[PDB]
């Protein structure tokens with residue numbers, strides 16, 4: 001197989017925020033989701049709660065979805081309905097797969113990754129949060145408790161919200177369900193990527209991401225002497241990236257990934273020669289952070305809309 005590169009899914013390839021889309025399809029409650037996702041950002045990056053990883057939002061959402069009666073077929077259907085790709089995603093992936101193998105590492109459910117990856121002909125390795133809804137038992141009382149508390153959580157903010165969620169997720173019966181999920185958060189992405197570098201003898205890991213959930217994978221790549229690439233990243237991603245791509249087309253990713261896969265350390269010297277419409281590529285150690293951030297966030301929202309400002313994945 002062609003040499004491997006590593007990539008997040010939502011942002012680089014698909015525009016969908018699947019955790020959000022599930023929440024909206026099942027509960028139609030954006031404030032509930034924003035609150036859970038803010039909590040995730042808070043615990044993972046601000047507090048750095050021991051054992052907590054950025055992108056565990058979907059893990060936290062799982063007991064609510066189970067309580068609402070979500071089954072694996074529903075996950076697949078919502079995956080189908082909500083799938084919206086970065087412009088040129090399939091065209092760019094087809095170009096890359098002529099020579100290289102993607103390893104996709106996502107916080108979203110592996111089932112959803114499988115269904116959506118096939119839509120743009122991904123032929124690589126897929127890693128995500130693992131759940132089997134059709135096995136999760138939720139007693140009638142607990143179902144009532146979880147469904148009732150949604151409006152409560154949505155109504156809270158700040159310290160009171162975080163306090164309430166700490167309490168909720170510490171309940172033995174809720175914790176039970178949360179622990180049945182094998183989640184992918186920031187730490188797991190780093191571990192998965194390192195495992196491939198070891199097993200496949202990759203001296204120069206090329207990793208692509210866009211949010212907090214990618215930051216440990218970014219640092220791990222940097223430590224190993226590879227490169228961390230953000231595609232329309234947010235502040236969290238940019239604070240840990242070597243290279244930032246600001247672009248409305250996945251063809252910019254195809255080109256930059258190609259350059260690094262071919263030339264490794266010597267790709268840096270040719271990035272300024274890449275000329276793709278509406279595409280800017282910044283080497284962060286030679287750039288003004290604030291300038292790059294403002295531009296990146298603008299493109300981020302252009303492509304992903306309001307979902308492009310959410311944390312949690």
Ligand SMILES: [Mg+2]
Pocket residue numbers: 008009010011012209210211313
């Ligand atoms: Mg992402």
